Structure formats: C-alpha cells, structure tokens
Design a protein around this ligand. Structure first.
Ligand SMILES: [Mg+2]
Ligand SMILES: [Mg+2]
Ligand SMILES: [Mg+2]
Ligand SMILES: [Mg+2]
Ligand SMILES: [Mg+2]
Ligand SMILES: [Mg+2]
Ligand SMILES: [Mg+2]
Ligand SMILES: [Mg+2]
Ligand SMILES: [Mg+2]
Ligand SMILES: [Mg+2]
Ligand SMILES: [Mg+2]
Ligand SMILES: [Mg+2]
Ligand SMILES: [Mg+2]
Ligand SMILES: [Mg+2]
Ligand SMILES: [Mg+2]
Ligand SMILES: [Mg+2]
Ligand SMILES: [Mg+2]
Ligand SMILES: [Mg+2]
Ligand SMILES: [Mg+2]
Ligand SMILES: [Mg+2]
Ligand SMILES: [Mg+2]
Ligand SMILES: [Mg+2]
Ligand SMILES: [Mg+2]
Ligand SMILES: [Mg+2]
Ligand SMILES: [Mg+2]
Ligand SMILES: [Mg+2]
Lengths: 149, 77
RNA sequence: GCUUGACUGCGAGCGUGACGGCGCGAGCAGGUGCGAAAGCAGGUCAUAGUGAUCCGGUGGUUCUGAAUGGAAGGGCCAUC
RNA sequence: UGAGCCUUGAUGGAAGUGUGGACGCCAGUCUGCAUGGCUUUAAUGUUUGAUGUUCUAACGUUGACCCGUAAUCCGGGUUGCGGACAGUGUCUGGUGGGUAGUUUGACUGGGGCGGUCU
RNA sequence: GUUUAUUAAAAACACAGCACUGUGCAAACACGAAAGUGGACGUAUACGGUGUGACGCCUGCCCGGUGCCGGAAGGUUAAUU
RNA sequence: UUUUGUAUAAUGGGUCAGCGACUUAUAUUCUGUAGCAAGGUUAACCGAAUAGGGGAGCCGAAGGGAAACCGAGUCUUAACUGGGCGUUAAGUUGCAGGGUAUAGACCCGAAACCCGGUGAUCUAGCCAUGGGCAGGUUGAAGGUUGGGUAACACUAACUGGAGGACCGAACCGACUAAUGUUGAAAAAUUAGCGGAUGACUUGUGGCUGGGGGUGAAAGGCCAAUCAAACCGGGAGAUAGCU
RNA sequence: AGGGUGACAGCCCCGUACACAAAAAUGCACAUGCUGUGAGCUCGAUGAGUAGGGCGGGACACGUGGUAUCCUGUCUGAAUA
RNA sequence: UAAGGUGAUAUGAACCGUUAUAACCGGCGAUUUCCGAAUGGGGAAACCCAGUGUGUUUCGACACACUAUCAUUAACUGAAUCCAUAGGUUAAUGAGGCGAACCGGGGGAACUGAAACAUCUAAGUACCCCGAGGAAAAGAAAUCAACCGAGAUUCCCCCAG
C-alpha cells in the first residue's frame, strides 16, 4: 500500500508527499478519514501536476515586478525632502508618514511605517540609499533632496 | 454461504493425500471476514463479507468501483 | 621362490531344467604370470555360502535428445 | 534494545594558577573539561529487525439505550467494556480405535499348539 | 424398583449414600460443516464425566510399567526463510 | 449327480403339460472355403445407393541392432577361426467355423458394500394435556393434656395421619406347572403367582431416524426382523463353491 | 401395397397408382410497411490484483516425475509492441 | 360432409333428420364447479374462515370481483439522526409449478478389478442438486507446425492399443 497524503500526518506526512504505508493503517484510518489516497497513478499525476503547476509555476509568478523598482532607476523628482535641523547638522526626525513627502507623487500613495533600520537614523549629509520595505525580498532606489527655506 | 461478495470465491473441494497417498475428500474455503468499509460517497458504512483478496481488490480498484459492480449485478450491499 | 590367469572378448560341443535358469568345456583373438623346456593358469579337491523384476544411485559411453544448437531425461557397458 | 549509514569529540590563535574517564611497554602520556596579556573508539539524527508499555481505528461483546417495530430474531445507530488480543482461512508439527478401510501365510494323518518353509 | 416384547427376572441394571475428576459462565459437556440450541432462564450447597453402591467397623504398602498432571535449562524437531 | 467306489441307508425329482442354460458385439489368430495375387483390400464419406466413387489407410513383399545405422545381411568384438538372429515356404480380403480378448460372456444362487427415499400407528425414551387405584391394616411427625423435674429431660393416655408401609380386587406384570406345538393363538389357555399412592398405571397429540435414535444397559427396542431397519437404486455386486 | 366380404377376390366393398381440394387458424420461405436498429471512412484506443511466482489440491492419456500446458483455496505479483 | 342419426357394456324409451342448422369431421370462439403452483387467510387436498368495493318496486343479508410471495420500475410516504438512507403503502410488468430423453454446471459412491490389499481401479459411473434450449455446449488462435506451411468450434474414419 502506497498512497499520497493530504493533511500533515505524523512520522511521514507532508501535505502531498509520496509515502509507502502499511496496508491497514490506510484502509482503516488514513482514508475513510481523509488524510491520504491510493497512489492510483491516475493520482501520482493528479497530485504531481500540482508539484509542477505550483512549485515552478506560482514560484515564478512571483517575478512580475522585478525589484518593483523598474523605471525608477534614475531617481525621483525631489518635491520637498525629509527635513533637517541643528543649524547645519540634523535634528528633526521622520514622522510615521515622512519619507514619502519627498517621493510624494511618483508611484502610488500610502501611509504606514514598516521601519527597516532600527538605528537613530544617521544625521549627516542627507542623500542615502538603503532599501526600505518593498516586499518579501527585493528593494528600491531613490534619493533625498533637502529644502533651503 | 461462505462466499466472497466481491470476488465470487466460494469453497472448493479436493483431496487430502497421506504419504501412503490416500485420497480423502476435503474442502478448501475462502479466508472470509466481513468488514466495515467507509464509503463517504454515501457518508455511510457498507459492510461486505469479504476475502482478504477481495479486500485487496477493494484496496486497488476502489470501493466506489467495487460497490459499482454488485449493484451492477443485482447484489445487495 | 617368482607372481596376479581370482585376465577381457568368445566358444565347437555336452549336461541339467516345464520355464526363468544353472553347469561343464577344449579351442580361437588380445594381453599377462610362472618355467630351460614340454608346458600350466579364465581362482580355491568337487559338490552349500544365496534373492528374479521393478524403482533409484554411481562411473563410462554424443547411441538417443519433441523447431535448431545444447541441456534435462532415456539407451547401452560396468557396478550399487 | 542487536546491527548498518550522516555526522560532530579518538587510532590510520601561547605558556602558567586549575578538572572526570584510562587497553594506559611498569611506572608514559592523554581525551575532554577552565581559563589568561575505506579500519580498532562516545552520543545525536537516523534505516533496519527483536522486547516492552500504552493508544484506537480493524475485529469481539451471550452490558445499557434509540429506532425500524406494539418484536426474546435481525439491521442501523449511541454508549460502555475489550482490543489488534481473541477468532476464522491457508499452510505445518503433535495427539487422535472417536470414526474408517483393511491385513493378520501355507504345510499339518482334522484343526490348533510344536515344528517346518531357500 | 429395572431387564433380555418371543426359552434367562437373577447374584445382572438401578438406587439413596460415598469418592475421584472437570467446570468462573458466551461454563464444561452435548446435537450441529453453520446459524441456532440443550446444560440453565441454572452460576461451584451448581452443572457434567467416571467409579463405588443403604448402613456398621474399616479401607494397609507400591508411582517401576501404562494413563494422566506440572516443569520459562539443554538436546532433537515442521511449515516458512 | 458326485465319487477311488454308490441298489446304496449318500444328492435331486409327487406326476403331466408349457417354459428353462455356451449367446451377442468388436477385436485378434488359426482351419475350411472363395476371390485376386507381389499384391490384397478399402474406412469415413459421395452416390448415379447392395452398383460406382473414395486407397486416407491397413497387412505383405527385408532383416539386424537398445539406437545412430547398416542392409540380404547385420549385431556381437579391436577382430572373431566364429557365434546369434536373418536371406531359401505368398500374401491379402471376404465368408463359415475352432480358440482367445473386452463385455453379465453358459444358466441360476449368497452373507454383504455404496447412494437416495419411506418409517416412533409396534416398541424405547421425553414433552404437553387428560383419566384410573374396590375393600381392609399399620398408626411416623406434630398437637393436647395429665404424671414428672428447680427448669429441661422423661412418661401415659388421647389426638393426629406419614410411608418407592402391609393384605387384597380393578389396573400393570409375568415366577412355576400342565395343556397346546399341521394351536382356539406366528407366544396363548387354565390353575397357582409379583406390584397395586407410586421410580405406579393408562387415553389423545407431539419430538428423536439408521453407524442414527432410545436404552434403570439385554446388543434390549425402533410396525410379527435388528451386532446395524424397511423401500428403490448401483445391480446381472462378486461366488477359484454347489 | 394392404384390408374386408359365408373358403384363398386386380374387375363385389374400402382402398391403392394418379390427378385434385380449404371459410378458417396456424409453420417456413421470400417481397413489402412500422418501430426500432446501426451501416461506410479517417484518427484513435488494444482487457492488472491480470500473466508470473511460493504453498495445498485439482485437471491434462501423463499416478511429481526430468514434467511443459490449464484451473485455483491460500500468500504474493509483472512487462505494456 | 351427408341420408342417416342421440359415445360404450347395452337393449329399450322418447326423439332428430333425408338437399341442407340431424348426425359426423376439421378451423375459430363461448362456457369451463372444487382440489391442485393454488396465490385473500387456514387446512388432515377436493374442505373451513375472512376483508375491501360493489348490487337488489322485498336495497336485512346473500350473489359478483378484487386482496399470496418475490423481483424491476414508478408514485405517494417516511425513522434512530435535521438533510439523507433504512423502512411503509400502492400501481404496472414479470416469475412461480409440471414434464421424456438429449444438454451445461454444482457435489459425487461402493461393490468390483489388482486372483488378499492400501497407491491404482470401478468412475467423474450410479446417484442428488441447479440451469437451459430445440438442441445444448464450443467457437474465430497469446492454435499448431517446423524453417515448407496450415489457419475458429463441432462431428466421423484413420494415426494406434
Ligand atoms: Mg476398526
Ligand atoms: Mg491350512
Ligand atoms: Mg422386587
Ligand atoms: Mg424372555
Ligand atoms: Mg422368565
Ligand atoms: Mg454429579
Ligand atoms: Mg458393583
Ligand atoms: Mg459389593
Ligand atoms: Mg466319499
Ligand atoms: Mg454295484
Ligand atoms: Mg437314494
Ligand atoms: Mg406399598
Ligand atoms: Mg398386594
Ligand atoms: Mg394367569
Ligand atoms: Mg404415542
Ligand atoms: Mg420387531
Ligand atoms: Mg436394500
Ligand atoms: Mg456396477
Ligand atoms: Mg446375482
Ligand atoms: Mg490484447
Ligand atoms: Mg386459497
Ligand atoms: Mg395456502
Ligand atoms: Mg473394498
Ligand atoms: Mg480385489
Ligand atoms: Mg448457443
Ligand atoms: Mg510464415
């Protein structure tokens, strides 16, 4: 008896792996109790067509907006900035909605603080390029231009 | 009626056969068991009287398919 | 004392058995021992000391060998 | 828990103030513990058999209940008790005059006993 | 009391009593290839089997043989592998 | 008829009539006879049907050797002076007959063995439900009461009414004798005889079925039978016997 | 052919040879209607708890033999032109 | 078809008939008690007892017809358990039993033969059981052959005791 699994299931389980299980355990518990299925071949494809239409399908459909930064590779228009202070140095910080005020008209409009660099956010020159939260992987690139008024 | 509901197996006759080669009428009979099979296609327990082998047949072909026959052939279940 | 004739293949022609069979036999062929030679030796002075057929084993032998080549198995000679 | 494989400690960022186990060539030195400017060895993850607990989900219920059903059968269902035991098929060793089929010689001054049988 | 209906009525059978032995209940046992059933609507003061055969006084020795009971070493030993 | 032998006092037969036992089929061989003859002859089938067709095939003209194989020879053996079996006699197909083979194989006869039915109207045991026991004895427990004891014990009357209790009819049995024994009767009659409130007796109906029942156990009973019932069947079992 | 008729009948009777017959119900043939029914071509597909195997039996003339082939009660179990 | 007729033992009686409704033969129909598969229930066959819908110038009661079981189908209903399933009622089809042999299948002896007997035989016989047709069964190659080739099944004759 072989059968492929549905749910987790201990000492073997794996949401759809290919295990070989003792006769009885299956026709007596694993099924007629939803947790696996006779590896009827009609199935080893029926439940492999997933291991293809998925683990190489929707793991490639993850690449549709590379780095998300596609044509933002020449910096964005510096509407305002992000602030300044201390008569030369820096002093004022970024509100829970204040690194957009500059890049405040490019892509789309939002307003949340997925803070990435848990430091006092270095206070010096002004123009930096780290990454910020763009997704579960990639990043982005733009700059910051202060205002002299 | 020692008779496998799935496979048709009933008892058969043969001899025994000593070293002296003595023929004596005997019977071979099916390893029968009668089991509670879960259908779900019917959300119920159909209990067939089966031979290990019948059970293997069910384990392969598939219950819904076995139950297909019988019904297909008039049998109860 | 020297030896392996307690040889292999055969066998005119006798015996004795209802039969199965048993028995005696010179002589021919090959090969051998003893003897200077003539020659003797196919066990033991003779007559008891034994068990058919089947089946099976062992050795030898292409005789056979189910499409063909082989093989298995069968035959034949020896033997258990 | 017997045996294989994978491995991280044994055969094939210095010196000093400090430690468990030992075939240690008979008197070593280590194998590790702290620090201080392919073949002889221990535990994991395993794979593979043995033994043991317990589980439940096959299977038993000649406990209780529901319904079919005005029913001491049956079936279904619920619950409880057991439980992969028990039991049953196939194979197998033993026992097995309970049952069966048979055998159990001839000669012989009748037969048997004795004796005899080439 | 019983018995050989038809050549045997007895000293044979049976009996109450006694003993051994098995049986925890879905009992043992028994009819039955089974289902079902007797035992028993009983439950060890019960149920079966075997022997003895009111009662009195009593029932010694033997466990080699055969039968049966117990034995978690060893030897030998089936299917299977 | 059987026997060494039978008037035999050994078998069979009262007598007459009718019936009653070596057959049939297919093979196979031999003899007789017929045809053809180194050949003879067809089977199924066809058919124009006892013709004709059909020569599949069978037997025979060649054996020897286990065989390969060789061949009027061949085998034995290394080979045989030789040995064995062969080469020198005509087959074949009908027809009648003599034997044999397989078949019931000349006829009749077992005790039995196997299969499948029928039978508890007799009997055995059990279940249900019903019926029956004249008459006469004995007189258990228990109870009352007196006597009696410190109280119990104990004791006498009475009362009571047990019992596989007694005697004895019906009823159930069947110990002895005689009769009978081509019976009145396929188990009785007559005189005696055991039980007779019980482990009694009996009516109706029911259950148990053959290696099975039932059995207070004799191998007893299961429809006049029982160490394995009756009926039909295997079946013409088999019979080296008569 | 045969049968009968007062004894044995071609010509006495009934028949036989031969030639003939059905309103009806049916049988078989064809021809047609009805309901069906599927026909031809091209591209496909091609029988798994199966074949095979262990064990036990059974069937093959074949009695486990050196024993192929077949069925299968029991345990198992392929390839895929 | 007809000039004779109402079967027979079996006369007689009373009748029918002669040119087409005597009789006689054949085709098709009517009727066809009870018992019997037996089917409303029962039952010791030919008898007992119902229920439901009907029907009577005398619409009590007594006549007529339906009402067995099982399977398939449908409709209506409908549990434990709310849906479902089970179950229940009804309706329409069908079956049921009988009976020669031949046939297919399930199971399957013994005497007997082996001059005893167990392997072996008798024999897959007798017998029992189920099933079916006019026939049954089998059948169009995972067959044979044998290096040429055959071309399903069945049956017969040889091959060959
Ligand atoms: Mg015996
Ligand atoms: Mg004698
Ligand atoms: Mg007495
Ligand atoms: Mg008597
Ligand atoms: Mg007497
Ligand atoms: Mg007792
Ligand atoms: Mg005694
Ligand atoms: Mg005594
Ligand atoms: Mg005499
Ligand atoms: Mg005389
Ligand atoms: Mg005389
Ligand atoms: Mg008395
Ligand atoms: Mg008396
Ligand atoms: Mg009298
Ligand atoms: Mg009676
Ligand atoms: Mg009698
Ligand atoms: Mg008889
Ligand atoms: Mg016979
Ligand atoms: Mg006879
Ligand atoms: Mg194919
Ligand atoms: Mg009726
Ligand atoms: Mg009736
Ligand atoms: Mg016999
Ligand atoms: Mg014999
Ligand atoms: Mg047909
Ligand atoms: Mg070809």
């Amino acid at each position: 008896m072989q059968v492929i699994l549905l749910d987790k299931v201990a000492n073997l389980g794996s949401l759809g792996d290919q295990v070989n299980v003792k006769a009885g355990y299956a026709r007596n518990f694993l099924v007629p109790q939803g947790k696996a299925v006779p590896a009827t071949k009609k199935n080893i494809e029926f439940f492999e067509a997933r291991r293809a239409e998925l683990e190489a399908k929707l793991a490639e459909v993850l690449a549709a907006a590379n780095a998300r930064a596609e044509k933002i590779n020449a910096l964005e228009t510096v509407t305002i900035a992000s602030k300044a202070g201390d008569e030369g140095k820096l002093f004022g910080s970024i509100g829970t909605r204040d690194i957009a005020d500059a890049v405040t008209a490019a892509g789309v409009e939002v307003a949340k603080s997925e803070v990435r660099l848990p430091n006092g956010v270095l206070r010096t020159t002004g123009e930096h390029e780290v990454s910020f939260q763009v997704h579960s992987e990639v990043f982005a690139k733009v700059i910051v231009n202060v205002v002299a008024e | 009626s020692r008779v496998c509901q799935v496979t048709g197996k009933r008892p058969v006759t043969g001899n025994n056969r000593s070293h002296a080669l003595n023929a004596t009428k005997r019977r071979f009979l099916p390893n029968l068991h009668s089991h509670r099979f879960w259908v779900e296609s019917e959300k119920r327990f159909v209990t067939l009287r089966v031979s290990a082998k019948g059970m293997r047949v069910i384990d392969k072909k598939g219950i819904d398919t076995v139950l297909a026959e019988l019904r297909a052939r008039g049998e109860k279940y």
